[PDB]
Design a protein around this motif. Sequence first.
Motif, PDB file in Angstrom:
ATOM      1  N   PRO B  88     -22.930  61.391 -16.027  1.00  0.00           N
ATOM      2  CA  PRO B  88     -22.900  61.863 -14.640  1.00  0.00           C
ATOM      3  C   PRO B  88     -23.646  63.179 -14.498  1.00  0.00           C
ATOM      4  O   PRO B  88     -23.635  64.022 -15.398  1.00  0.00           O
ATOM      5  CB  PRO B  88     -21.404  62.030 -14.354  1.00  0.00           C
ATOM      6  N   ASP B  89     -24.302  63.347 -13.354  1.00  0.00           N
ATOM      7  CA  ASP B  89     -25.097  64.544 -13.090  1.00  0.00           C
ATOM      8  C   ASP B  89     -24.267  65.563 -12.310  1.00  0.00           C
ATOM      9  O   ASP B  89     -24.543  65.898 -11.158  1.00  0.00           O
ATOM     10  CB  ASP B  89     -26.390  64.175 -12.361  1.00  0.00           C
ATOM     11  N   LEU B  90     -23.226  66.058 -12.977  1.00  0.00           N
ATOM     12  CA  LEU B  90     -22.389  67.104 -12.402  1.00  0.00           C
ATOM     13  C   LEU B  90     -23.188  68.396 -12.293  1.00  0.00           C
ATOM     14  O   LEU B  90     -23.683  68.913 -13.299  1.00  0.00           O
ATOM     15  CB  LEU B  90     -21.142  67.317 -13.254  1.00  0.00           C
ATOM     16  N   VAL B  91     -23.309  68.919 -11.077  1.00  0.00           N
ATOM     17  CA  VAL B  91     -24.120  70.093 -10.793  1.00  0.00           C
ATOM     18  C   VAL B  91     -23.248  71.129 -10.100  1.00  0.00           C
ATOM     19  O   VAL B  91     -22.422  70.792  -9.242  1.00  0.00           O
ATOM     20  CB  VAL B  91     -25.349  69.737  -9.926  1.00  0.00           C
ATOM     21  N   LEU B  92     -23.406  72.386 -10.510  1.00  0.00           N
ATOM     22  CA  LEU B  92     -22.808  73.522  -9.821  1.00  0.00           C
ATOM     23  C   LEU B  92     -23.629  73.808  -8.568  1.00  0.00           C
ATOM     24  O   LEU B  92     -24.779  74.250  -8.662  1.00  0.00           O
ATOM     25  CB  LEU B  92     -22.766  74.732 -10.748  1.00  0.00           C
ATOM     26  N   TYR B  93     -23.046  73.539  -7.396  1.00  0.00           N
ATOM     27  CA  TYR B  93     -23.773  73.705  -6.139  1.00  0.00           C
ATOM     28  C   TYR B  93     -24.151  75.160  -5.897  1.00  0.00           C
ATOM     29  O   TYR B  93     -25.265  75.452  -5.447  1.00  0.00           O
ATOM     30  CB  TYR B  93     -22.941  73.176  -4.970  1.00  0.00           C
ATOM     31  N   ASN B  94     -23.240  76.088  -6.190  1.00  0.00           N
ATOM     32  CA  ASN B  94     -23.479  77.508  -5.965  1.00  0.00           C
ATOM     33  C   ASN B  94     -24.022  78.214  -7.201  1.00  0.00           C
ATOM     34  O   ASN B  94     -23.748  79.404  -7.403  1.00  0.00           O
ATOM     35  CB  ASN B  94     -22.198  78.186  -5.474  1.00  0.00           C
ATOM     36  N   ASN B  95     -24.781  77.506  -8.035  1.00  0.00           N
ATOM     37  CA  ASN B  95     -25.417  78.117  -9.195  1.00  0.00           C
ATOM     38  C   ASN B  95     -26.405  79.195  -8.764  1.00  0.00           C
ATOM     39  O   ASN B  95     -27.125  79.041  -7.774  1.00  0.00           O
ATOM     40  CB  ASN B  95     -26.130  77.044 -10.016  1.00  0.00           C
ATOM     41  N   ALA B  96     -26.439  80.296  -9.515  1.00  0.00           N
ATOM     42  CA  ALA B  96     -27.257  81.449  -9.163  1.00  0.00           C
ATOM     43  C   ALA B  96     -28.424  81.655 -10.120  1.00  0.00           C
ATOM     44  O   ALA B  96     -29.578  81.681  -9.685  1.00  0.00           O
ATOM     45  CB  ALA B  96     -26.380  82.708  -9.106  1.00  0.00           C
ATOM     46  N   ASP B  97     -28.161  81.795 -11.419  1.00  0.00           N
ATOM     47  CA  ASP B  97     -29.223  82.078 -12.376  1.00  0.00           C
ATOM     48  C   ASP B  97     -29.213  81.087 -13.532  1.00  0.00           C
ATOM     49  O   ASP B  97     -30.260  80.806 -14.125  1.00  0.00           O
ATOM     50  CB  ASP B  97     -29.099  83.506 -12.916  1.00  0.00           C
ATOM     51  N   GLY B  98     -28.040  80.550 -13.854  1.00  0.00           N
ATOM     52  CA  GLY B  98     -27.887  79.670 -14.991  1.00  0.00           C
ATOM     53  C   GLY B  98     -28.416  78.275 -14.719  1.00  0.00           C
ATOM     54  O   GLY B  98     -29.053  77.996 -13.703  1.00  0.00           O
ATOM     55  N   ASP B  99     -28.158  77.386 -15.674  1.00  0.00           N
ATOM     56  CA  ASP B  99     -28.547  75.993 -15.517  1.00  0.00           C
ATOM     57  C   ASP B  99     -27.648  75.305 -14.500  1.00  0.00           C
ATOM     58  O   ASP B  99     -26.444  75.567 -14.432  1.00  0.00           O
ATOM     59  CB  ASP B  99     -28.484  75.266 -16.859  1.00  0.00           C
ATOM     60  N   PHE B 100     -28.246  74.419 -13.700  1.00  0.00           N
ATOM     61  CA  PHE B 100     -27.486  73.719 -12.671  1.00  0.00           C
ATOM     62  C   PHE B 100     -26.505  72.721 -13.270  1.00  0.00           C
ATOM     63  O   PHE B 100     -25.414  72.525 -12.724  1.00  0.00           O
ATOM     64  CB  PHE B 100     -28.437  73.016 -11.703  1.00  0.00           C
ATOM     65  N   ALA B 101     -26.868  72.083 -14.382  1.00  0.00           N
ATOM     66  CA  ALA B 101     -25.996  71.088 -14.992  1.00  0.00           C
ATOM     67  C   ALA B 101     -25.855  71.305 -16.492  1.00  0.00           C
ATOM     68  O   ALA B 101     -26.276  72.337 -17.023  1.00  0.00           O
ATOM     69  CB  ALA B 101     -26.518  69.678 -14.716  1.00  0.00           C
ATOM     70  N   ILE B 102     -25.254  70.331 -17.176  1.00  0.00           N
ATOM     71  CA  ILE B 102     -25.050  70.423 -18.615  1.00  0.00           C
ATOM     72  C   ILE B 102     -26.390  70.310 -19.326  1.00  0.00           C
ATOM     73  O   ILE B 102     -27.204  69.430 -19.016  1.00  0.00           O
ATOM     74  CB  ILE B 102     -24.073  69.335 -19.084  1.00  0.00           C
ATOM     75  N   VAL B 103     -26.631  71.207 -20.279  1.00  0.00           N
ATOM     76  CA  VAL B 103     -27.887  71.218 -21.016  1.00  0.00           C
ATOM     77  C   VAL B 103     -27.698  71.126 -22.526  1.00  0.00           C
ATOM     78  O   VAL B 103     -28.650  70.752 -23.231  1.00  0.00           O
ATOM     79  CB  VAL B 103     -28.722  72.467 -20.655  1.00  0.00           C
ATOM     80  N   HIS B 104     -26.512  71.427 -23.061  1.00  0.00           N
ATOM     81  CA  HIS B 104     -26.336  71.427 -24.510  1.00  0.00           C
ATOM     82  C   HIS B 104     -26.267  70.012 -25.073  1.00  0.00           C
ATOM     83  O   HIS B 104     -26.818  69.747 -26.147  1.00  0.00           O
ATOM     84  CB  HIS B 104     -25.087  72.221 -24.887  1.00  0.00           C
TER      85      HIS B 104
END
Lengths: 404, 398, 391, 424, 404
Positions: B88-104
């Motif tokens: 699933p493409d869980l994304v932080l809607y209010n992301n500021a500087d970090g990655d929007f989704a899981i990257v590890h």
Amino acid sequence: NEEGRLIEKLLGDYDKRIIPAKTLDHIIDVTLKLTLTNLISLNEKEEALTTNVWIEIQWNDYRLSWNTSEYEGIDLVRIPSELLWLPDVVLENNVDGQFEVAYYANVLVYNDGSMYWLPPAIYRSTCPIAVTYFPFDWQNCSLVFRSQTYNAHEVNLQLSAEEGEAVEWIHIDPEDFTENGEWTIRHRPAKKNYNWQLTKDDTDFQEIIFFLIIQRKPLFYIINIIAPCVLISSLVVLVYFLPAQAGGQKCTLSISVLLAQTIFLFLIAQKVPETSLNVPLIGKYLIFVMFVSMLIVMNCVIVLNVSLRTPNTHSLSEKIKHLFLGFLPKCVEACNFIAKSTKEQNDSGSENENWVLIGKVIDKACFWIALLLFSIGTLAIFLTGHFNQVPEFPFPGDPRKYVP
Amino acid sequence: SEHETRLVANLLENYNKVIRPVEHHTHFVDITVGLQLIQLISVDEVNQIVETNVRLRQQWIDVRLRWNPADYGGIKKIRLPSDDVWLPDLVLYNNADGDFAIVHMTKLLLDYTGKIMWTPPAIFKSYCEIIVTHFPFDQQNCTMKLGIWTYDGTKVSISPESDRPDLSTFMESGEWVMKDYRGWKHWVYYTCCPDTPYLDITYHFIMQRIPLYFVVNVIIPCLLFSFLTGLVFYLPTDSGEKMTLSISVLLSLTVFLLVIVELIPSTSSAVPLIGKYMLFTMIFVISSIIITVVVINTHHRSPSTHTMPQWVRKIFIDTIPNVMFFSTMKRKNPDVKSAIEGVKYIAEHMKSDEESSNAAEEWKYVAMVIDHILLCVFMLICIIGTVSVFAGRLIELS
Amino acid sequence: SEHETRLVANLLENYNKVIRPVEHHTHFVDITVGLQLIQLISVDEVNQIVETNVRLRQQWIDVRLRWNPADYGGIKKIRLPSDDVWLPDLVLYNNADGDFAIVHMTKLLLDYTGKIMWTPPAIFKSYCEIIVTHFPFDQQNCTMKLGIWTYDGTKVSISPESDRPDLSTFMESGEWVMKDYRGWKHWVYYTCCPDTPYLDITYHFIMQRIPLYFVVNVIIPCLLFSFLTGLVFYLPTDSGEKMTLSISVLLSLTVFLLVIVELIPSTSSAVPLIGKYMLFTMIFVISSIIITVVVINTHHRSPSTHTMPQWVRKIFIDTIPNVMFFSTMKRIEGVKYIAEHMKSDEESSNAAEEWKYVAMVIDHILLCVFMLICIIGTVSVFAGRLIELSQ
Amino acid sequence: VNEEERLINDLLIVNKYNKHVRPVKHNNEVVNIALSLTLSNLISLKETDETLTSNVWMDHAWYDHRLTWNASEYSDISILRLPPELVWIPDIVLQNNNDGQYHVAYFCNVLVRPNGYVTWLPPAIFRSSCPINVLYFPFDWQNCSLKFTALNYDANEITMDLMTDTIDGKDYPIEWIIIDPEAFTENGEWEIIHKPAKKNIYPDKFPNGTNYQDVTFYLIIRRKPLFYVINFITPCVLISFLASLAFYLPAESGEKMSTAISVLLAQAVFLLLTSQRLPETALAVPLIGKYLMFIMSLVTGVIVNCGIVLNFHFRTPSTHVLSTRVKQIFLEKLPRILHMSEIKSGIDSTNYIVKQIKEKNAYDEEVGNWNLVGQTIDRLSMFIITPVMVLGTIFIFVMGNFNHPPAKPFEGDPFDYSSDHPRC
Amino acid sequence: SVMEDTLLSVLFETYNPKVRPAQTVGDKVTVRVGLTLTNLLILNEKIEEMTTNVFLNLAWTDYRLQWDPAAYEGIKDLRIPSSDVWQPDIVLMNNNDGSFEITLHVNVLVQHTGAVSWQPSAIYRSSCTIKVMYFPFDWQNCTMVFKSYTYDTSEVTLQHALDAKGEREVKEIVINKDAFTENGQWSIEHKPSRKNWRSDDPSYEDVTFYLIIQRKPLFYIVYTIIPCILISILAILVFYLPPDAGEKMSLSISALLAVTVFLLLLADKVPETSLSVPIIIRYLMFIMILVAFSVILSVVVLNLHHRSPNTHTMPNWIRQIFIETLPPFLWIQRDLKEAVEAIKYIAEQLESASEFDDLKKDWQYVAMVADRLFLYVFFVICSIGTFSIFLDASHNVPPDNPFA
């Protein structure tokens, strides 16, 4: 699941390195829309505007079409962006090497080949800072989007239209948008721009420009820098009421006010930009108050020199005395020796008192001039800063507001 | 084991990572999403960005990734790379500087019934509004908004694992106290299609800042400077340091302004309580300097240039000093005749000197009474100003 | 279209990327290299790093990537990913902190005749020597040395597109003005192999720093401090605020040294003009304070301890006040004991008055010479560079 | 057509060139790998984090029997170019580095000769970690090393050595960092002096380990102290010399303590600058730091002495009584050894006035004696403090200036590693 | 062809690095973990983050990686790229940033018995809570926890690494005498290794390496302690200046300004932790409070000195305390008749002046005695406070038992 066979049929003979033009001399419309989720920062030290934006890109691809009746009514398919062709719409005027989007989200495809992509991105665009009215200034810089690997003969960038009218703005969400805390979005126009210097065959012939008129909130600078410096520079006008004696502390007060202004200069030098095209308004005010403090120090030295003159050192001419005292409409001989010494020291003290009165007169004369100069300079500079407001229209030559 | 290699080879033979893992396209995947915090990395007020360390417990059911354990030597649970199965493409809607989704993209646990459990780590740089009005005693309400980006309701539905985020392994931040932490699930409908809800999960934390550091390093020097500002009125004007003390404590406050700038956040959303107290101290110092300028000017006022008015003298001599009981206030030949004339002249000169010194002494007494009165007034003003600035928030805390 | 996919498949069916594109291995690839400067990002003098945004126009001819357009529906120009074709090893030889070669790897234009034009963007962090002798009015000559890293002459030849880099899209940097720009092609021969020239291209930019920022931030406070430390000598010694004023302007210069260290580069190659002027102001303040101490001590000389020399009286009593036209300076038993003590006090105070007059004359002549020294020092520091700039 | 494609296909596809297999005939053999360094430009040496950033071209040379070809058969092809992704390479790693780089920056194409000789020159930017000897700051010299190892293979499989250059038919090992004189640009704050190179073998560890041998390139870099002399040293020394003049100010003027305390404030500002421009290592006190501490304590002693002199100056008969011994020793030794330069009521009131005049004259002569005592103790304090202060502030910077790196780069090796005089 | 190629072809024909090498279903893989610290780079207090260079010695056993060296050319050991063999995901759980995994990814060494050893090197940035109470004379108990991120105790079993010979367990952080640069600010008092698997969750198990590091405070002693001691000396010296000099305030408030400058210096380096106040900050605040009290008492002394009988009257208790009792304990002790009546008036004026001067001298004596008392009290309290603070600081020795 029917999506499995649908994807296997669609991507079986798909080449992502090929433009989706049906025939020769076919130009694909690439409609763009922005959505500023939140304004991160504007760092004026390197003149970079960091923003968080969702970019809606819509186009048409003749390959990815299917008759929904043959399948089980599926009419909207999500495909990862790495497996599909992209217009390569990138931000040209970046301050870093980051050109593409920051997430590469899945892209939705419809029956008619309509393709809708909504990647989010964090863009550190360039922003030439106008330091003329710092910190009460307003900044007019923009994000420029263009096709990096295609020209106007292949793609046709344009602003997206929703209900029949072109969306010529940034369209921030009215509810789910927090203020920056130091910047207010006054106007957010958007327009398609041509360079008109390069040919149509060049990839840089067309662009989409999203402006951002941002007005800086000067509250922090007023509270922590401007008002204390104003109070310090107002203190230096008090020096004309201190007596011109040993314990007068006139020059001490003035030079310590100058030292405080130097410390304020050290504080200011860590914040102001280094564009060097124009002097910041806060810098102009600081130079003005330093010059005023230097003049006041000179006046204090002159006043102390005048009031401490002696008949044994200088001679009080009748002209100066008249000018500064008329033009102010605003075995037994030991006793004789003692008497004559008392008389001569009384005369010298009287002339010293005349010099002190001249010093008082020149103090009262120069105090009003210094106060008027300081007040007029401060009021003029800060009224010029306050009167610097965002223009009513986003473009002076157009009557539209570019506001939904 | 060779059994596990055979199982993996048979499972990933015809798997397609792109396709949503549902039996029929009209159905949806029920994804249980929970968040467990580990440590509060940082909170930045000048950018309103909060960096946290989280683990995302994501559970769902994939019908393609099932097997009979008795057909593979009794294996029930296996580990698979996350790049091999649908994610699933869980994304932080209010992301500021970090990655929007899981990257590890760490490995995930797969059961024999298809229950994919995945616990990837992440560093979320979320954007939450920072209320700086009550700094440093402020109380921040910081939210992280997770949502399925491309899909929507009736395709990929997320549900909270628990009513609250897991903080069992949450180490102490050392600067903030977790007063409360909750997680809510929001349905948002759009007028274009009322039968397609959009689902999101917001986890909100109530962090109350520990104020000891800012009290010790900022509040105490400002309080000391404010206390020393009013002390100058007890310094007699006969000493030449009456102006020196005031302007030097002003210089000390100006130097400490550098520390204040380098310590407190620089935001223009609202003036913090630190800024209010600093401005109050600055205005207090400026007013004290103006007042002591007035006192010095009225201390050296010559009797010849200015005569003492009756009203002010009357008040400051016989009414005000009587009120202050605690203060120790004071309430035949030419040469012979030429010598005689000289003696008379020096006698009358001494008389005039005594008269002038007495008038000057009256001026000094008036200045001293003014000094005592304004010392009491400024001490009271400093105390009540500090109380009015801080006691409201101090009472509101308790 | 299907024609473009068929053309790309046919072109890339037997293509080998690791093979140099020549018909014969003895021939070379003629590569036309040009540079365009989008903007000047930054210049750092403490490390000599110039960060720039640079777009590289690289053109060559690949005989393998050719086709007849009429066979494929009339398509003449296509776009291909740069990772599917042979690429030159263009490297910034004097790279400092950034990447040595092209990293972004954008698409490239391919013609039917085999011509390939590739325009990748990049960020170049050049390591060019920085002369801080004439700071902040300095002129910086920064070079970028592009070259084929692995291949050499008679294998890959590199030639400049134009004699000057293209600045059509160049944005004004604000802190610098691009006075001049040019590019040259260098052959370098080695003694071991004198028949294999090594080719490179050096693009040199001559840039001028706009000095308004450092003039406002640095020069004006230094001038103010110099004027104040020159004017300090007009203050009479009777007031006890002479040394306080002198050491306070000294302290203001000391705390402005914080700003000076913060702003100016920390480069030890040579002393900048800012450093020279700051050192001159420091020596000025030190000398002014020293002679202030001298004149303060000479003001309080008691006649009981010291005696007035005849030469001091001759100099500072008769000759110097004559030429000082500007200044307005003048050119029964017990009562007997009281009279004698009064006479002694009068003569002692007269001698003290003579000492004070000598101190005042010294103060006036020192004020004049210090104002002259300040003016001459400022002129000698800055007017030469100003005249060089004006020409 | 091009013969290079045929040669590559025969070398790497027909023979099945395995990238992960060490190039030896037998597994017991050892691959000889020669290394060299070419410092293109020293970027910086940031002492706050003890990090040396540098730009180096690493030169690797070895043999590969699988890459040999008959040159005359393949249309006379001498040199061949091959990307590292298809040819076995030794992964030489900078072991000591504060950043997580551990690798070269570009991976340029390697060059192959028909006999199997393979060379490789990948450029790299390295951020190494070297401790900062801050003992003689800012006139100090640093000894920063790059320690290249081969963690992928043990010493029994590969052996690292310094690359050899043939001059006049004789082989000389390159035991120095190669610097191109016409291309290298000297750093704005540092100068390179010795730049030796060595191969270290540790006998206490077994050859089958990965830490048996390494190659270390040293840099004995001298800092040019001109910036710190102009901005930090000379103004501080001038302020310290100004502090001595507080003994020349008469006590009559009310500025004796003010100049000394403001000099101390200026020295505190200089201390703040020095702490802002120095690391936090506690191996030893820096030269500038100990000079600043010494001069600050001496200025504090000057302030104490000025306070004592002012206390002696304002003593009055109504508060203090001068002893015979103190005024005797002072006024008899110090200036000599320092060469210092109705009718009845009327007459009753008259003699009362005379008595008051006598009393006040005695009072002011006692005050004058106290003033003379203060002046002579001030003169003695000046003649004590000024010479020791100037001698200390000369000696500290003289010892600092005399600090030079030794002529021999190592402690005992008399080779004097340089490119002018190669060994063997 | 070299037989290494054929051995690799035989080994990796059916190998899969996605599966743990449990030969029987339900078995476990015994993994031995040890650490080798190469260079402890930094311990940043502003982030509470330790950056170090480590080698992560790992040892396990694969039943698939077995071969007979007799059947080949005596190949007893082999070098494999780390991406081909199975690898436990042993990571640093308490890492501050996102770098969970290793950096270099060196080759693994495989013996013919099946034992696999691995020594990858990595730059690791962990996070340790910092005891900021005794800064900078403190000691830090930093922690590095290593465990398999994916596999739990039912699949792997973590143990300790062995020595150079396979006889004993190290049970501590191995340090190489070669290739170890000692950190200039930290000393490694204890470096133990342990396993502290929890009890509430049986599946948890990890290997923890502890670093007890003592800071060498010489930098803060030179740059902060000595200037504060000198300022305290000046604050004591303030009470020895005569009141008539007029430099008591000019010394005390300047000492306060110097304390403010030193606090400005300290504000950059002190930790941001609000749990406790550092002892250096407490010492700075104590010095600042002492200087402020010196300012207050010098103001009182000057006020007492400048009093006159026409402004103040001496009360009985002041005369009893500051004249009679304390100075013994403080070693301080001690027609012509018109002309005739004019001379009489002069004598009367002299008498009045002498009485006024006597009362003023009594006030000055009271001021001097109070000044000496304040000097002695201030010296005693400053010495006691500084001695107690430094005695508490010097007793912060790290404990002998590292709890291994």
